[PDB]
Each structure stands twice: as C-alpha cells, then as structure tokens.
Amino acid sequence: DPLRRTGRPFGGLIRDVRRRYPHYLSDFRDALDPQCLAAVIFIYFAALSPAITFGGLLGEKTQDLIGVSELIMSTALQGVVFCLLGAQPLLVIGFSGPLLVFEEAFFSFCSSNHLEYLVGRVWIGFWLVFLALLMVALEGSFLVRFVSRFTQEIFAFLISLIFIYETFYKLVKIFQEHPLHGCKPRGQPNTALLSLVLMAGTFFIAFFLRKFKNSRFFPGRIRRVIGDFGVPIAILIMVLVDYSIEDTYTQKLSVPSGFSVTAPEKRGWVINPLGEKSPFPVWMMVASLLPAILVFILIFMETQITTLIISKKERMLQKGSGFHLDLLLIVAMGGICALFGLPWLAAATVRSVTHANALTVMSKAVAPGDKPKIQEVKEQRVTGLLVALLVGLSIVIGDLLRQIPLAVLFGIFLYMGVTSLNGIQFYERLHLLLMPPKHHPDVTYVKKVRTLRMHLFTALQLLCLALLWAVMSTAASLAFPFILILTVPLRMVVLTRIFTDREMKCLDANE
Amino acid sequence: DPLRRTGRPFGGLIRDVRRRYPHYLSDFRDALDPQCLAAVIFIYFAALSPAITFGGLLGEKTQDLIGVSELIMSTALQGVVFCLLGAQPLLVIGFSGPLLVFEEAFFSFCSSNHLEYLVGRVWIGFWLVFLALLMVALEGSFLVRFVSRFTQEIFAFLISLIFIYETFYKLVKIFQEHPLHGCKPRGQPNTALLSLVLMAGTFFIAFFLRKFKNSRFFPGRIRRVIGDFGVPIAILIMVLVDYSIEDTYTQKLSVPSGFSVTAPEKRGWVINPLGEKSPFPVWMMVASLLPAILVFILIFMETQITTLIISKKERMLQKGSGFHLDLLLIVAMGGICALFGLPWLAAATVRSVTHANALTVMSKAVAPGDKPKIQEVKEQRVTGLLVALLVGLSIVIGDLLRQIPLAVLFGIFLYMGVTSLNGIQFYERLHLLLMPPKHHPDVTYVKKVRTLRMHLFTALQLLCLALLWAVMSTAASLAFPFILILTVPLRMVVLTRIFTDREMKCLDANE
C-alpha cells in the first residue's frame, strides 16, 4: 500500500524513489511508437493555447507585470524539470483559473495597501517551500486515502463541464463583435459564420476519424495508424481550407517575439527579496503565511485529485505512481519560480486526462461484446518532455503559428472536452435517469441495489455539483477548494446514515 | 403468379381488379395513425419542390408555353385519379428529367419545321393511348418477369446517385453567384454561408432524430412517435432559426398566384387537334407514331422498374400489386392530359421509395442482434390522395410558403437521397470491397461463393452503372432506356457463360 504511514521521516519519499526509479531506462525505450508522436502533436496545441490566453488575461489584469512570455518560460521550465525528475510523467502542468483569480485578488490587495506586487510573491514562495518541506517530512500525504470516488467523480465532471462551457462561450463573442449586418478589425462581414463553419468542420472530422478507428474497414494496422492521427489530420485539413480563402478576415494565433519581459521599463529577471525601489515593510515578512496556506491548499487539492483520477485500476497503469515526490517537486518549483517573477503552476486535469487516454491501447473484442477493454497505457518520459520543450521554443517559430485560426482550435477543444467524460460512473449513471428500468445494463451497481436508491444517490451528487458550480460563479470564488474538501466529511457522516452498508459498497466501490 | 399469361383477352386486368379491389374499405381504415400524418407532411414538400423547379426550367426552355401552374395542375389531377383508382397507391407520379429532355428536343424539332408545338403533342397522346390499350389487350405486361435483380439494383443506385449529385450541385451555384468578397439580388454578403449552415443543420437534426428512434431512451411509445416526426421537426426548427435573422438575404420558396395559364396572350386551356392559327399538316398526323413509341418506352420502363423495386419480398407488402391496371391508368392519363396542354407524368423512384419506407414498422430486435427486420408496411389509399390534394391547392396558400428557404429543403433532399440506399444488395456488396475477408457478414452470397467471384460480379455491375451514367451525361441522352434494356440480354447471355449456375443462384437470387 503506497498510502501507508511508514512511521519514519521522509519514508514515503524514499519508498517512492525506490519504487519508481528502477524502471527508468524503460521509460525512454517505450517512446518508439507512432502513437507517441501523435500524442505529442495533439498535446502541443492544447498546452500552448491556454498559456497564451491566460497570459493575455493576466497582462490585462495587472499593470503589465506578468504577461505571456513569462508564462511560456515558466511552463517550459517547470514541465521539463518535472518530466525529467517526476514520478508520474503523465501529468501536464499549466496555469489554472483559480490561480488567475488569486493573482488578481493579491494584486488588488497590494494596490489598496500600497505594497509591491512582485515582492510579496517572493515571500509567498518561500513560505510555500517551507510548508511543502514540512508536510513531506511528516508524511502528511497519506490523507488522500479519504478522497473516495464520490469526490473524484464530482471534480472530473465539473472540470469537463467548465471546459465545454468556456469553449462554447468563446464563440458567442465573435458574433457579438462581428454582427451580421451587410452593406483589430471589427464589424467585418463573413467572419462570424466562417469561424462557426471551421469549428464545426474540425470537430466533425475529428469525431469521424475517431469512430473509423474501431470500425471493420481496411487492414488493422493501417486502420489503427490512421485512427490515432485524427486530430492532426483534422487540424491540417481545415487550416488548408481557411488558407485557400483570401478576402475574408479571421483571427489568427498570436505568439510574442523575443525572449524578454513584457515591460522592461519597470521590471527585471531577478527580483530583490527586499524592496526593489522602496523598503519592504517587515510586518508583511511574516504576514505572507496566510496566502501561502491558500496557495498550498489549491495546488495540493488539484494535483492530488488529478493523480488519483488518472491512476484508477480500470486504467492499466503498471509502473506505479507516487503522491509524495510529485507534490514536493511541484511545490518547490512553484516557490522557487516566484523569485524570478514567474507564475506558479499545477497539474491541469483535462490536459492530463487527454494525455493519459491518448496513449492507451485497446484489445480486440471479437464481433460481439462490450466496448473493448483497456489493454495497456504505454507510459514513458519522452512525450511530456518533448511537449514542454516545443512549447518553450515556440517563440523562434511563430511565423508558421500565425497562419492557424483560433476557430480551428475551438473544435479541438470541444472534442477534448466531450471525450473526457468517458470512464466516469457518475456520467454513466446519468444516462440511466432516462432509460427505462428494463434496459439498464448488467453492472454490479444495478443488480445489487434498487433503481430508486441509485437515482437518489445520483441526485445527491448532482446537488453537490450544482452547489460547487454556484460557489465558483459567485464573487467569493477563492473558497472553492475549501467547499470541495467538505465532501469527504459529508460522505463519512451523512451518506453512511442515509444509505445501508451494501448500497454504499456497491455504489462507492474502490474498484 | 401475377405475371402469368392467362390467354384470354384482357385477362391480366380482370385478375388485378379482382385481386386488389376486395380490400378496398381496408385501405381507408388503415389511415388512422400518426405515422400517416408524418408521411403526408414529409412527402408534401418532396412532391412540391421538384414541380416548381421543373416548371421553371420548362418555361425557360420553351417560349413560355408550359410553365409551373400547368405542371402543378397536372400533378394534382393525375395523382388524385391514380390514388382513387390505382392498384398500387404507394406510387408518386411526377415529372422526370428524361421527360424534360424529350420535351426540349421535341420543341427544338418543331421550331425549325414551321410546325406547332402544343398541337403536335395531341396526336402523340392519341398514339400513346392507342398503344397502351393494344398492349393491355394482348397482356404484354408479363415481360417484367425477365427483369432480374441485376437491373433493379443498377437502376436504384443510379437514381439515388443522380439525386445526391443534383442536390449537392444546387449549392455550388449559390457560392458562384454570391462570392465571398466583403466591403434578383446578386453579390450579397453573408448569403452563401448562411445557406450552407441551414442545410447542414437540417440534415444533422434529421439524422440525429432518426437515430434516436432506435435507441433505448424514453418510453417506447413516445420514442417512436418522436422518431417518426423527425423531418417536420427539423424543418420547423431551422425555418424558425432563419426567420429570427433580420437583414441577411436568403432565397425563398416561390409559387405562382392564380389558376391561370402562364401566357394567356397566346394560349388556352383547350387545344384544337385540327389547328390553332394555321392548318396542321396531315403528314405529321401519322408521323407522330415515332415519338409516341419513345415516350411509351420511357414511361413503361420507369413505372415497371419502380413497381418491381417497391414490391420486393424483403418488404412486407401483403395486399398485392398490379402491373397491368397501373400502367393502363398512367398511360391513359398521360395521353388524355396532352389534349389540355398539360405535361405527361410517371412514377418517381426516389419519392416512391421514400413514401413506401416511411410507412414501414420495425419489430423489436435482440440487443446483440442485427438490424430489426421489417414487420409491416401499412399500405393505404389516404396518404397519396392527401399529398396530391395538398399540392393541387398550394396556390391559395403561398404567403406561408414564401417564408421557407430553399437551403432548408436541400438538407431534406440529401437526407432522402442517403437513406434510399438501404436495402440494395449492390450497395451492401460495395462495403465488402473494403472490409477484410475475415469480417464479411453471415449471408448466403458470402459462404456459398468465393470472394474473388463476388468482387468480379460487383465490378461488372459498377462498369454497367458507369456506362449508363456516361450515356446519360452525353448529349445523346434520349437513348438511356434503350441502353438500360440491354442489361437483360447481357445477363441472359454473357453472365451465364462467365459464371456457374450455383454462383448465379446465390448472387442473383429472386428472394
């Protein structure tokens, strides 16, 4: 049991190191496969685009202190280091909305109280490093044993729903700013419809090529090779399609040029821990502990839940995972980066899931039978390193990246969001709310429990998810991780009383 | 055996009358079903739109002698009479391209001969009536027993392919006349993309609602009721969507106003056989026999092949079909109508198939089983009569019909064309050309015949179909029926020599 209290200092870290490191040379040898290259190509864009979007947003919110170049450098460096020395290379680390909310709140607080914005973050990082070291020393990462399925399912469903909603909402603004009237360009004709056509075409091509993979046409080898290259093929096809058109205007991908800070007139690479232009008050030296706890809670919750989700026994992960080394590495890297004015990073989730399930191999299921069961996942240390390296050097190139419209990427994002719902018991039980009781499948949680009890369980889960979404939307969005943690006591106290033992084992089974 | 030489004069007609008429009151009592109303709504537009398009084309080709109003009246009257007294009410009577080609050729011939056009189309009708009576008297309709599957499959596939190609080509002209530039309408912005969006949306909504019918969601009754109303729902949804948009211009459905001739200044309802402005030469009175034979061959071939296709034993038609009464009625109506200047009509293959397979009922199948087998077809005499009556009076209304864009109808036409390919062995054997030999299904023409022989048979069929299409495209398009008839001797002579008896029985099975 990896999540066992050894009883000795740094015991969990040492156990993880001995468990994972022996299979080191095998990690790099398992990269000889076309699926690896397809995964690299697919994940490069998924990692790059959010970096640019969030960098633009962060630059807009702050007074041009953190922009896009800093975010790109931070992502590249942290990803490279984590994939070189991490224990779970199937994790993609990048900005997250909660981080943006916290950064904006901290900037507002500093402006209100007349304090430097890039000086407090250094002390926040110092406190974060100290807290991570203290927690790893005491083996406090064993508490993940109490994060059951009732929380992982809610987290995954909420993340996927938010992803889909954001992708859909990014397209309404194009119609709002380019209305259909007829007679930084604004008010252009033939733009809002061309964007929609491009996005729909990309999505449908990707979906069709995914379906063709499991079909009975063509030889098996060629069919599988083409099926695993669907996303690049769709991207290439519609990029060419929009390139053919000449007079219409579409928004392109914008990547800054030059490895330099956004505002060199008032910034530098190295930030003095003390005041840079005026003395830093001492009272803030020790008062920085409070935001450090919040940042640590956010990062820990996100990373641990993502690692739990991508390590389910249904998925065939053979080399093993580690909950101690990964957290230490991520928190230390985040704390150290603040000394250079770079933002913090954490495991993505949707990107991590799309990366993990893009390397899976499905076994033949004969003519009849259920959906083919997972055979292997093919983990290695080459894909993530390559993705991070490519994202880091996306500045030297960028003339080619300027010929790619954003509407094409919106379809890929929608395809990523829709396919991430597969493998969640909550989603599968949501279908049963519409099917008649005689058509329910032969799963364990169907024969051993009554239909009404399962429906009540699903309704309670939906209520919790709706409450979490409502909390996130409200201005008090910094308390989301705290509200998420409350699900564990809920399951431990209320659900045990409401439901019987057999029902709880059947619905909330570990495997 | 319906196709048996009775010997007695007019024996086939009498046999058909006694076989079909007894089940008369049942035809009108089987119309109490929501599926009947759904079929009526679906088929109304499919019948109306081609009438308008072909009427416009005919008016353009001739000097405004036959237009749209005459075609509408002819369709309505002939449909009503045929459905009231016909033996196979599952047939839809409407113009056909070959008829347009023949009409244009006849007009061109009469133009450079100093001869009338409408006067010359009365003797053709007289000769057609005489020929139909002579053939029915001698029981010459028994020859349809030599038309095997090798010809029906080719005919059906060619008709469906031409339908799909025409529907797709109707959309390229919109882009050609409304190019994307940006700055009797012409050169408008946002018009070529809105039409594409509307067509795609209509098609996809119809397809999704069709798939939802066979799913496991919702109660069976509600699911089936919603599934059989997919086309009207799609039409309504996008008509509303297009109506919401204000200033963008789209082409609407246009129908003439008033029950009057297109060119009253130089035409009338009744045409004098002797002449209208100048005496009609006698030499042409007896020379009209030649075009009469060609028209008779066209109508006979089309109607007989359509009746054969819709009467396959795979489909469950229990009330019986008639090959003599139907042909007699159709030819007599076509000949008589020419006396009033109205065009001839014939059964429509695609419309007839879509009508027949829109009234079918599917039985419940096994979860790990094949597609459900057909249970019944639910034939009656109310749907076709209602469709003809509605098309006839589509002139009093038309303010409502002017709010329906054509791009919406293009999607319905594409859906009709794609779904018509189901049930053809030639189409099913085309998939096998791509599947590996180990995945071929468990059918009789797979186990009893070596794969290469079946592929050779499919290749020969494809060669014949390509030759027929090439002949149709070429200017010498009036010889298409003659080329089609040559397939029967080909099958009787060459295929028998090339292939063995055992292979021929399996590949060319009657049932």
Side-chain angles (χ1 to χ4, degrees):
Chain A
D1 203 344
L3 299 169
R4 210 242 317 151
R5 265 313 305 278
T6 312
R8 293 177 287 115
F10 294 97
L13 184 87
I14 303 170
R15 284 183 9 218
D16 285 30
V17 189
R18 293 182 183 174
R19 162 193 318 137
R20 188 47 195 245
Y21 273 11
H23 317 297
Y24 188 86
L25 175 79
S26 297
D27 276 312
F28 288 91
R29 256 145 74 71
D30 300 349
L32 304 159
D33 206 3
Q35 216 172 355
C36 306
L37 169 52
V40 163
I41 291 169
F42 180 19
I43 307 304
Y44 171 63
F45 291 102
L48 172 74
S49 52
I52 288 172
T53 288
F54 279 117
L57 263 163
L58 202 60
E60 258 146 47
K61 288 187 191 304
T62 77
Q63 296 314 318
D64 177 30
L65 278 153
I66 300 166
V68 176
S69 197
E70 289 135 330
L71 194 35
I72 288 175
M73 281 171 240
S74 165
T75 286
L77 206 145
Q78 298 211 38
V80 178
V81 157
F82 176 81
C83 282
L84 256 185
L85 281 178
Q88 173 68 330
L90 251 57
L91 279 183
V92 186
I93 89 173
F95 193 54
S96 295
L99 303 181
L100 184 80
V101 173
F102 174 78
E103 295 269 45
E104 86 179 5
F106 194 56
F107 186 86
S108 288
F109 171 88
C110 285
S111 90
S112 284
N113 283 114
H114 295 166
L115 275 78
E116 296 93 293
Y117 171 77
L118 289 202
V119 179
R121 282 178 81 252
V122 181
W123 304 106
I124 285 190
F126 284 169
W127 279 122
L128 277 177
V129 147
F130 168 76
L131 275 186
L133 230 44
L134 179 93
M135 169 139 154
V136 164
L138 299 193
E139 290 180 353
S141 182
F142 85 102
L143 298 174
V144 300
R145 291 184 40 267
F146 303 149
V147 171
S148 56
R149 188 196 291 278
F150 186 75
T151 313
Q152 312 167 32
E153 308 298 68
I154 281 171
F155 191 72
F157 203 62
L158 191 66
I159 297 310
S160 287
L161 281 199
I162 284 163
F163 197 67
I164 289 163
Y165 164 84
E166 277 177 351
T167 280
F168 262 121
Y169 171 85
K170 265 193 297 186
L171 185 89
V172 162
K173 281 151 40 202
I174 302 183
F175 275 90
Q176 267 175 15
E177 87 170 309
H178 289 286
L180 309 179
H181 279 132
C183 185
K184 299 171 284 187
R186 291 193 297 274
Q188 304 292 107
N190 296 307
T191 288
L193 286 164
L194 189 57
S195 307
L196 179 66
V197 163
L198 294 174
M199 162 192 171
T202 312
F203 172 78
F204 276 118
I205 298 187
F207 215 62
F208 161 60
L209 275 174
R210 164 193 185 86
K211 281 189 179 303
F212 165 73
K213 181 176 64 182
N214 325 311
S215 73
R216 291 193 297 274
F217 297 91
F218 289 68
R221 296 285 292 278
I222 297 169
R223 170 166 83 252
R224 272 182 262 303
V225 158
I226 287 178
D228 81 15
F229 265 99
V231 165
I233 289 170
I235 282 171
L236 181 72
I237 279 168
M238 296 296 180
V239 162
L240 286 178
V241 159
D242 180 65
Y243 166 69
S244 64
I245 306 163
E246 151 209 352
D247 265 313
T248 309
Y249 153 79
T250 50
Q251 198 174 3
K252 302 285 161 148
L253 197 65
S254 50
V255 205
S257 86
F259 293 122
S260 69
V261 302
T262 61
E265 61 189 340
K266 52 177 181 174
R267 196 194 186 285
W269 285 119
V270 183
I271 278 156
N272 187 42
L274 296 157
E276 59 198 350
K277 63 165 72 81
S278 67
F280 205 52
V282 178
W283 74 267
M284 182 81 201
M285 299 261 204
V286 313
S288 294
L289 191 67
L290 301 214
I293 299 165
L294 194 66
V295 177
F296 183 91
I297 293 172
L298 281 173
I299 296 185
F300 175 80
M301 215 81 258
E302 277 155 23
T303 316
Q304 302 296 261
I305 298 200
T306 305
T307 307
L308 273 174
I309 283 170
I310 64 170
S311 274
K312 270 165 178 166
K313 285 328 300 170
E314 299 81 317
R315 313 159 164 71
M316 301 289 155
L317 273 205
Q318 249 57 63
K319 285 184 179 183
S321 162
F323 301 83
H324 291 85
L325 191 61
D326 288 347
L327 181 75
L328 170 66
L329 269 166
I330 287 183
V331 177
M333 270 177 333
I336 279 309
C337 284
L339 190 56
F340 295 151
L342 284 59
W344 311 303
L345 294 197
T349 321
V350 187
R351 271 137 79 194
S352 293
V353 165
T354 297
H355 186 204
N357 88 17
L359 299 160
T360 71
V361 163
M362 301 290 262
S363 64
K364 300 176 185 175
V366 201
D370 62 353
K371 180 102 192 65
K373 72 166 178 60
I374 299 155
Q375 200 198 18
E376 67 163 4
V377 165
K378 190 194 313 288
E379 55 248 11
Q380 83 285 32
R381 287 251 178 95
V382 166
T383 290
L385 179 63
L386 278 177
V387 165
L389 196 70
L390 297 189
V391 157
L393 67 89
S394 83
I395 270 175
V396 302
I397 82 168
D399 49 49
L400 154 81
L401 282 174
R402 250 172 270 283
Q403 308 299 317
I404 294 171
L406 296 186
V408 165
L409 295 180
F410 296 163
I412 298 305
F413 298 164
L414 207 70
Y415 164 80
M416 295 189 2
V418 151
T419 41
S420 285
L421 300 162
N422 304 342
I424 296 164
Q425 276 204 3
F426 184 22
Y427 186 53
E428 297 173 349
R429 276 192 271 107
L430 270 176
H431 297 175
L432 273 47
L433 277 169
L434 317 170
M435 282 176 195
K438 47 159 308 189
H439 285 115
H440 290 345
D442 49 36
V443 286
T444 320
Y445 54 83
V446 160
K447 288 181 170 61
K448 321 281 312 172
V449 295
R450 299 194 257 122
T451 303
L452 285 177
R453 313 294 280 166
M454 149 171 105
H455 286 349
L456 185 72
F457 194 75
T458 316
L460 290 191
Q461 222 156 1
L462 263 169
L463 202 87
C464 295
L465 185 134
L467 188 148
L468 273 169
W469 204 339
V471 162
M472 200 168 323
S473 169
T474 278
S477 176
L478 271 194
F480 162 68
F482 286 83
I483 304 302
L484 185 67
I485 281 172
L486 290 191
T487 52
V488 176
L490 183 62
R491 168 218 64 159
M492 287 196 135
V493 172
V494 163
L495 289 205
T496 278
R497 284 209 307 71
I498 288 175
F499 290 85
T500 59
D501 206 353
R502 201 35 197 193
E503 292 172 2
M504 290 294 312
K505 327 324 262 173
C506 288
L507 291 160
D508 207 321
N510 297 279
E511 66 262 340
Chain B
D1 204 344
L3 294 159
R4 197 200 94 240
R5 275 294 321 258
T6 308
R8 328 178 272 129
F10 288 97
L13 185 86
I14 304 169
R15 298 217 289 81
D16 267 295
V17 189
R18 293 182 183 174
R19 161 193 318 137
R20 188 47 196 245
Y21 273 11
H23 317 297
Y24 193 83
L25 174 97
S26 294
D27 281 309
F28 289 92
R29 269 202 198 281
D30 297 346
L32 304 159
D33 206 3
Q35 216 172 355
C36 306
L37 170 52
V40 163
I41 291 170
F42 180 19
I43 307 304
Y44 171 63
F45 291 102
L48 172 74
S49 53
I52 288 172
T53 288
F54 279 117
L57 264 163
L58 202 60
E60 261 142 47
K61 288 187 191 304
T62 77
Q63 296 314 318
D64 179 32
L65 278 153
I66 300 166
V68 176
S69 197
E70 289 135 330
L71 194 35
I72 288 175
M73 281 171 240
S74 166
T75 286
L77 207 146
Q78 298 211 38
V80 187
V81 157
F82 176 81
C83 282
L84 248 192
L85 281 178
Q88 173 68 326
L90 251 57
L91 280 184
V92 185
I93 313 301
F95 192 59
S96 295
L99 301 182
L100 183 80
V101 171
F102 174 78
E103 294 270 45
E104 101 188 353
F106 193 57
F107 187 86
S108 288
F109 168 85
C110 287
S111 90
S112 37
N113 270 320
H114 312 116
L115 282 152
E116 288 83 359
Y117 174 76
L118 295 196
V119 173
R121 277 183 67 257
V122 169
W123 305 102
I124 284 179
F126 285 170
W127 280 121
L128 277 177
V129 156
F130 165 80
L131 277 179
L133 264 177
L134 181 92
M135 170 138 154
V136 160
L138 298 193
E139 310 202 328
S141 183
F142 87 102
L143 290 184
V144 323
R145 72 208 318 305
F146 298 98
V147 175
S148 43
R149 172 193 308 281
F150 187 74
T151 313
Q152 311 167 32
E153 308 298 68
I154 280 172
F155 191 72
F157 203 62
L158 192 66
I159 296 310
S160 287
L161 281 200
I162 284 165
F163 197 67
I164 289 163
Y165 164 84
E166 277 177 351
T167 280
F168 262 121
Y169 171 85
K170 265 193 297 185
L171 185 89
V172 162
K173 281 151 40 202
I174 302 183
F175 274 90
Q176 267 176 15
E177 86 170 311
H178 290 286
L180 309 180
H181 279 132
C183 185
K184 304 173 186 179
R186 228 177 279 101
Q188 302 286 105
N190 298 306
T191 286
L193 287 161
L194 189 57
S195 309
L196 179 65
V197 163
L198 295 174
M199 164 192 186
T202 312
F203 172 78
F204 276 118
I205 298 187
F207 215 62
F208 161 59
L209 276 174
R210 164 193 186 86
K211 282 189 179 303
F212 165 73
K213 181 177 64 182
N214 324 313
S215 73
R216 291 193 297 274
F217 297 91
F218 289 68
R221 296 285 292 277
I222 297 169
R223 171 165 83 252
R224 272 181 262 303
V225 158
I226 286 178
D228 67 22
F229 266 98
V231 165
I233 289 170
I235 282 171
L236 181 72
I237 280 168
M238 296 296 180
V239 162
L240 286 178
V241 159
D242 169 65
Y243 169 69
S244 63
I245 304 163
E246 169 194 5
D247 184 1
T248 301
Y249 155 79
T250 50
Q251 198 174 3
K252 296 288 187 294
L253 196 69
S254 68
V255 322
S257 75
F259 297 115
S260 71
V261 196
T262 62
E265 62 190 341
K266 52 177 181 174
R267 195 192 183 285
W269 286 119
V270 184
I271 281 150
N272 171 279
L274 299 172
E276 198 162 1
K277 292 183 291 294
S278 66
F280 200 55
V282 178
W283 74 266
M284 175 87 204
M285 286 194 190
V286 317
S288 293
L289 191 67
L290 301 214
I293 299 165
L294 195 65
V295 176
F296 183 91
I297 286 151
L298 280 170
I299 296 185
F300 175 80
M301 215 78 260
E302 277 155 23
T303 315
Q304 302 296 260
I305 298 200
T306 305
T307 307
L308 273 173
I309 283 170
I310 63 171
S311 272
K312 270 165 178 166
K313 276 324 310 184
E314 297 80 317
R315 314 158 165 71
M316 298 287 156
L317 289 178
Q318 335 281 348
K319 273 177 180 184
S321 175
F323 289 89
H324 300 84
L325 189 62
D326 287 349
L327 180 75
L328 171 65
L329 271 165
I330 287 184
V331 176
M333 269 176 335
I336 279 309
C337 285
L339 191 56
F340 295 146
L342 285 60
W344 313 303
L345 301 184
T349 306
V350 185
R351 276 136 78 185
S352 292
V353 165
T354 296
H355 186 204
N357 88 17
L359 299 161
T360 72
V361 161
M362 300 279 270
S363 64
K364 300 176 185 175
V366 194
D370 55 23
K371 190 71 174 66
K373 60 177 178 294
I374 301 156
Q375 202 199 17
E376 67 163 4
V377 178
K378 188 196 314 287
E379 54 248 11
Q380 84 285 32
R381 285 249 178 94
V382 166
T383 287
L385 169 66
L386 278 177
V387 165
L389 195 70
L390 296 189
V391 157
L393 62 90
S394 84
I395 270 174
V396 303
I397 82 168
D399 49 49
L400 154 81
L401 283 174
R402 250 173 270 283
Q403 309 299 317
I404 294 171
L406 296 185
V408 165
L409 295 180
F410 296 163
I412 298 305
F413 298 164
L414 207 70
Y415 164 80
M416 295 189 3
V418 151
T419 40
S420 285
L421 300 162
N422 304 342
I424 296 163
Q425 279 202 3
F426 182 24
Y427 185 53
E428 299 175 347
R429 275 192 269 107
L430 273 174
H431 301 174
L432 274 47
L433 276 169
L434 317 170
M435 282 176 195
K438 72 181 290 295
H439 282 128
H440 297 330
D442 271 320
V443 285
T444 320
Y445 52 83
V446 169
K447 265 74 181 176
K448 303 294 181 69
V449 175
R450 147 166 73 244
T451 301
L452 280 194
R453 313 294 279 166
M454 149 174 108
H455 285 170
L456 185 72
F457 194 75
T458 315
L460 290 191
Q461 222 157 1
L462 263 169
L463 214 81
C464 295
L465 185 134
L467 188 148
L468 273 169
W469 204 339
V471 161
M472 197 165 330
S473 168
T474 278
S477 176
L478 270 194
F480 161 69
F482 286 89
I483 305 303
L484 184 66
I485 281 173
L486 291 191
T487 52
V488 174
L490 180 62
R491 184 180 65 255
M492 298 192 134
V493 170
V494 165
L495 289 204
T496 278
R497 158 201 103 188
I498 289 175
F499 288 85
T500 90
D501 184 318
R502 187 193 173 61
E503 298 176 356
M504 290 289 315
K505 323 322 262 173
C506 287
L507 289 162
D508 204 319
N510 297 279
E511 66 262 337

